[PDB]
Amino acid sequence: DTLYKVITRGMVFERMMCTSEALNQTPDMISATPARLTFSQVLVQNPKPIMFRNAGDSSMIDRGLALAEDVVGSAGDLFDYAVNGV
Amino acid sequence: MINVSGFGTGIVIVSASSFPMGFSLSKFADDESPISSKELEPFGYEMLYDGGLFAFDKAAPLEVSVSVIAGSEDDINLRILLNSKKGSFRFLPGIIPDMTTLVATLPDGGRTVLSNGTILKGPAIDTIQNTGRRKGNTYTFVFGSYLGAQTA
């Protein structure tokens, strides 16, 4: 889920995820453990997003053609709970 | 007192086919070591990933260098052994062509028997040094199994 940013000596990269890991256990080293990792970049169009600070001030997502899914208790009782308060 | 002298040493060399009856070595060289050998490493060891130790058994050959005075009968006999072409004649199953046995006596009386081996290097023509002499000829054997009986 998380995207990571990597800062080497002078070079800064963004949108990376780890893709590998290779531990090693050898008589050459007992105290420590030599490891070799690997990262790959997530490629996306429009690398610089555009953001609005107002939630109402935003565009319109589109959700299409779902089902009413029914499975509901009753008609009168739910309304008599919703307006009478209980 | 301990006596570690080498004067009075003899070597009798017998070969399976070329020299069925054998010959003897008496004229050893004086500039170079008469008889010499390399170390025997019949063991090894390996390290385990936690730092432990493990020892096993290896296969170890044995090498001998024998030096003689040039122009002796010993030198010509060893040259004859050297020129014996291993390809010729016929051998027993699992026996190696020309299974050579070398038995050497210490001056005290102790004796050593080495078998299952052959000769593998040596000089072809004599060498004349700076001083005007002839360099001592040196030949090398290799053996597979040995023995030892150091009582007398």
Query: Residue A56 has which token pair?
Result: 């109402």
DSSP character at residue B135:
P
Partner A contacted by B55 (CB < 8 A): no
- Cα B22–Cα B25–Cα B27 angle in degrees, nearest 5: 150
How many CA atoms does the CB half-sphere of B54 hold within 13 Å? 7
Provide the shortest C-alpha distance from residue A24 to chain B (in Å): 11
DSSP character at residue A38:
E
Name the method of structure determination. cryo-EM
CA distance B89 to B98: 10
DSSP codes, B66-97: EEE-TTSHHHHHHHHHHH--TTSS---TTS-S
Provide the shortest C-alpha distance from residue A20 to chain B (in Å): 24
Query: Residue B89 has which token pair?
Result: 């004649």
CB atoms within 10 A of CB B98: 19
b/e B99-123 (16+ beta carbons within 10 angstroms → b): bbbbbbeeeeeeeeebeebbbeebb
**Residue whose token pair is 């990262």:** A39
